[PDB]
Amino acid sequence: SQPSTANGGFPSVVVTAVTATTSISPDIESTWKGLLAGESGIHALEDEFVTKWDLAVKIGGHLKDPVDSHMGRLDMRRMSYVQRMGKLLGGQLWESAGSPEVDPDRFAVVVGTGLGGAERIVESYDLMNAGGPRKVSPLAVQMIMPNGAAAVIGLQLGARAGVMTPVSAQSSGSEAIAHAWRQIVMGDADVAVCGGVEGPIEALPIAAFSMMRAMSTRNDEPERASRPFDKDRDGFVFGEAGALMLIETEEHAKARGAKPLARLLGAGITSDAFHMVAPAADGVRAGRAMTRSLELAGLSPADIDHVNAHGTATPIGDAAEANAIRVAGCDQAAVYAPKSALGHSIGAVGALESVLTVLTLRDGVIPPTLNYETPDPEIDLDVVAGEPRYGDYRYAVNNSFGFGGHNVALAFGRY
Template sequence: MKRPAIAVTGLGMITPVGHTTDTTWDGVCAGVSPARTVPELLGCEVDFACTVSGIDLDDAVGGRTAFRMGRYVKFALLAAREAVADAGLDPAHWDGTRVAVVVGTSSGGSAGLTEQAVALERRGPGATSPSGILLTIPNMPAAEIAIGMRATGPSLAPCTACSSGVTALSVARDMLTLGQCDIAIAGATESIVFPVAMTGLVLERADDARARGAVPRALIAGAGATTDAHHPTSPHPSGDVARAAVDAALRDAGWQAEDVDHVNAHGTSTPLNDATEAALIGRSYPHRPPVTAPKGVLGHCMGAAGAIEAGLTILTLQHGVVPPIANLDAPEPGFDIDCVTKTPREVPVRRAVSHSFGFGGQNAVIALQAP
């Protein structure tokens, strides 16, 4: 049986450079990081970060339910609302039994858990929130989206560290392929010591989307996942297992390496990770497609990073523009890759891949193509 094409029909983002998809894209293309000193980190050796600011989350969420939501949940709900509206869907009129929600996270509500622990120690049990559990458990972003969107289909919260977002997209794609749902709201969210970011995507079978008159932003062509089984934080120095995830995604998409027009790299700007990934890119894509890495602008959004970067890759497909890697003049000597630096590069992009490599050696790669 032929596998149905899966379309991304809606995007929603809240990131350190924008509270919407459009403003995030503009910020990433500008190539300027919003990193600043963060009060929560004062006294630490590193006291700066890229954070979401300039938005009243409670006011944006609205209603009387915001009190029970951690910041990571509010980000998720707001991004999901934008994605659903962008897809031209209305939860008041869809069959909620056929709508799934898959929202990944790396650390869930660890910030909320820390706040509750400090309150307990300093002021006693009476100072803790009666909603303490809801402020910390990792499935609450998916749960609150399901409640707010009247989505009564499957609801999942995958955790694969920094690759959680791509894992969520891959799971949602499989659910649509298997007929377990007709619409999937997928993405990832994160808020550790401070607010970070969230991306939501609406996925549908492409035929279903076109039948209702929706124009897909992109198609998910393939996905691949592997585990290094090597070290809790360091990648396997050979890069062979991560490359196997790339190969699996290309094989799933039915592509050859030379079909890839652009690579959105994990690009953490750490010596081991960058050296391993640069070598992987050089071996996997010898034709040297243009490479970007959004963490130079956004910082590392942890569990949300993969979803944000997949969303930005979709926007590159749409606009034919590869954003620059912020704070990079040129790749390290010996890195045989074509890094986009200084300014955005206009280039036709029909097929692209986005890499996500997480702590624990969890590798996830997603292949995206123009509709």
């Protein structure tokens, strides 16, 4: 019969450290306290690029503490932005873990991102148009390539059991943690740094998503604009983030005296084959990704206390995900939609929300979904709102979905 975590057919895998930088704080613990106190990272954008172009979207969450105030002169010339973000979070995470001395040959890195060092593409293009091929940096290829942030972290921390970069648009950061889990349970690694990084809010990304008519334009009240599951939602809001976690076998963690924050029990990856940029309405394949993570974990849907929803606040996205949660039999879980406060960080967001799922399990508390004011009869979920919801949560699923029809669900447990 089928290997599961519960039946011992997969080894036990624990989360032993987390790190993130957000529009609320550069410190994940302070981001967590702010979320619980009802704080939002979303504000009026003050960038001159908003005025230069008169963008229809004038709201978003920049990082509280910009990555580049941490970067040396050479990093600014030799790395793309997602690489600098990767380096920053990778060193923070390692220090957080107690700087363990691990076997490099049993250590993997899996880090997702939406695009890569795309600013270096436009830089290279301009440099060559103005001055010819000899003006392109000899570092352009390694700064641009989308595996470049994962590679930087792997080099920095010494990972020799693989360095992988799954890209699946807005599920990339979750999918990275899924593949790290597979690398460990298939025997390829005992320890893995995983998660996601993403570029900052800029004019061209805004322009491109805005032309999809995907984004909230509630510019006069920025903190109220992101309303996942609310009746009056009008699209997503960008909120910058990067997040990594350290996962390892329980035996590896025990042998070095690490204190686990949670367990990572299983991962489901499916696809819709429905539309390139809208989720299937029926939620069936998305609900199957949740169900698969439960099969691998050895759990039933009634075990699931908590769902951390992808919850983008688009009208059709939230409706599809509500249907997916019912398909999976998880619609009596308490649901949190963290994009209500942190906005959408695209290739990083699944990793950020998996970190938040881990903290919910460690601490016994789910923050309030901001802006949740008018229940939507198509949604019919238990959306935590108003104040935090306390409980002894045993098991939780984190959802992420991505343009291309990608569905990723991760099942975590209390340690």
